[PDB]
């Protein structure tokens, strides 16, 4: 499942858009618009669990990548939106603790909108693209070809093991 949850200025989901056909079958039947990120993560992971797109008994990996462009402020100061973004990431990390608790690895990556745009033209989701980000940070040569064809299990494993083995 590959999904992009648009979050609007009310700290609610504007629209949910799947990038993978299996994720379409996850989104169907779920109200996600007046939910927060943690809510969406929980809805998506739990439906993927039922449907067999993620295993509860088997070891998996979930990547929550959030990309945020703050080009607005409103009120009298941009800290109004920054408090919303604080609550946003507050909510994101709580989902991680909730969904990973079953013995599944869940991780958080942060991206900018410019990174989101790069993943859109390659029609890939931001989670797998965020492992590509870590490849660039650790100076490992992973290509966009690698990222789009590979499994997220392989992607997170190779990057986090790179930072473990010398």
């Amino acid at each position: 499942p590959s999904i992009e949850l648009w979050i609007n200025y009310n700290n609610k989901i504007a629209e949910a858009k799947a990038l993978n056909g299996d994720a379409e079958t996850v989104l169907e039947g779920l109200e996600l618009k007046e939910k927060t990120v943690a809510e969406a993560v929980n809805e998506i992971v739990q439906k993927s669990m039922e449907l067999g797109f993620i295993s509860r008994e088997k070891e998996n990996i979930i990547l929550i990548s959030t990309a945020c462009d703050l080009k607005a402020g409103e009120g009298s100061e941009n800290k109004d939106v920054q408090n919303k973004i604080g609550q946003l990431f507050d909510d994101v990390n709580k989902a991680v603790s909730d969904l990973k608790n079953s013995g599944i690895t869940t991780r958080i990556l942060n991206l900018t909108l410019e990174e989101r745009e790069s993943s859109k033209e390659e029609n890939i989701s931001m989670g797998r693209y965020a492992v590509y980000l870590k490849a660039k940070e650790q100076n490992v040569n992973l290509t966009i070809d690698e990222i789009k064809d590979a499994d997220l299990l392989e992607l997170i494993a190779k990057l986090e093991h790179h930072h473990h083995h010398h």
């Binding site: 949850l5 609007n8 992971v45 797109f53 979930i62």
Partner: peptide, 10 residues
Amino acid sequence: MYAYVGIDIN
């Protein structure tokens, strides 16, 4: 405009 959350599973 605000945030975009990418959820990748598998």
